[PDB]
Design a binder for this molecule. Sequence first.
Ligand code: HEM
Ligand SMILES: OC[C@H]1O[C@H](O[C@H]2[C@H](O)[C@@H](O)[C@H](OCCCCCC3CCCCC3)O[C@@H]2CO)[C@H](O)[C@@H](O)[C@@H]1O
Ligand SMILES: *C(=O)Cc1cc2ccccc2c2ccccc12
Length: 461
Amino acid sequence: GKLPPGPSPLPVLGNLLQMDRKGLLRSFLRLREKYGDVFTVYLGSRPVVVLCGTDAIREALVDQAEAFSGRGKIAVVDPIFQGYGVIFANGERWRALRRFSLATMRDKRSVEERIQEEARCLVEELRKSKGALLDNTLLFHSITSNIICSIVFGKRFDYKDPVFLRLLDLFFQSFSLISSFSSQVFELFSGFLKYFPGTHRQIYRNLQEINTFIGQSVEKHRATLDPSNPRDFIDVYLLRMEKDKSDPSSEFHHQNLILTVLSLFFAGTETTSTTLRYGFLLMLKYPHVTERVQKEIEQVIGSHRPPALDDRAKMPYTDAVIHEIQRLGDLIPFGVPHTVTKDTQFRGYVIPKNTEVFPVLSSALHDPRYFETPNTFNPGHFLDANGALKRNEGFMPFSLGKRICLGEGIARTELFLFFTTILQNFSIASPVPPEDIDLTPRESGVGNVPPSYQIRFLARH
Ligand code: HEM
Ligand SMILES: OC[C@H]1O[C@H](O[C@H]2[C@H](O)[C@@H](O)[C@H](OCCCCCC3CCCCC3)O[C@@H]2CO)[C@H](O)[C@@H](O)[C@@H]1O
Ligand SMILES: *C(=O)Cc1cc2ccccc2c2ccccc12
């Protein structure tokens, strides 16, 4: 017995009265001030253990990896996934799906070359605009999704493709709704609120419309399949289904196929797109940073050949900028919920099997032990005296352990290549003066959404 300390819950409302009106994160952080780095809060009738500060998150996700390798539910999307797909699977199912998903993408065209192709495509599209004002939200969604579309469907979509844009539109307005205050209220009281209209029904329709698109893509694949030459993620999955016909315990069937594909879209598009969008807002607010990036781009890569992934090792400052963008961006602030896979002894407290655990990544990315000024943009957080890249234990935007972001490599490959290839060909400007640029996110929840802004991409001759 004895859970981490916490405020006295009510039978139904849990700790509702102890919460902050600003959000779940702001509630989590306010309770840390009173109860410390590891506490219990009751979101409704269920208890969750919240983990604050670098040291405590590492003590759980790294030191007791297996115990904290369990995935928790998110109320607004569970109806879609229902424990199927790689993100929300558990036990043997997750282990199977994740291993497959790693091994599949770990090896036609490499993921690096696909990203380079999208980079080239983006630069060509940005030249068209001829240095006019634009909101980069749409294009940043397109490129990120086009990487996943390349991995999954075995091709990419033109930026002004209407069906692509329509399904992109609805898929992305889903993240806006997921990160809303209303959806956070739904997290606590889904048991009652599910029978009533709300954001959750819209998120339901939007994700089902994509599941439907995936479903029929799977069928186009099943019908154009060449076993000798699997073109993408789906083909490899389908061939795996054939190999596991006789095995009754195989997880490689329809529901897992559909929802793993969505999972790769659901996870591998938005935050990447948002990180890039936040990136350029900071790059507008700090032209001198941008200038030493482009200076480093010039020195290492040139202005002729496109940037490649082995240039990163030779570009510590740009790498430090990217790290710092990711750190300050803080796109998944209270992380994605884990559960303990068994009864777990932790920091003198005992966490009962299947209890939900919240690794607050914001409290780690803003840890004053590891960063001088946690609230100020400073690529220097990741630079030593020699101007070399410097690992920082507080840096965990992809979380840690067995559940670490399955697509870390891909993300950082996207981030690097997109940032460098854009800034190689383009200098940036905005009608808003640097010192007048606001960084406060438009929405804050399980995802942070940076405010929308106008930007110029001016070709460099
Ligand atoms: C800006 C880039 C990205 C960031 C910061 C990010 C962050 C995260 C975080 C915080 C988690 C939760 C891990 C946990 O349970 O603690 C996660 C999980 C996951 N991510 Fe990402 N992500 C990014 C992009 C991607 C990409 C490009 C992919 C692949 C296409 C991807 C695929 C996944 C998957 C499959 C999981 C669940 C893995 C599991 O539960 O075992 N993500 N990511
Ligand atoms: O090139 C023309 C031929 O290709 C067609 O493919 C269509 C298909 O109808 C269809 O696959 C496609 O629509 C794709 C919508 C994009 C969905 C991807 C989203 C899913 C996740 C969230 C964001 C991206 O549009 C394609 C047009 O390029 C069809 O196969 C034919 O009708 C047509 O003759
Ligand atoms: C950024 O990738 C957004 C995001 C990722 C994610 C990854 C795994 C599980 C759940 C995730 C999210 C849930 C809710 C909102 C955003 C995300």
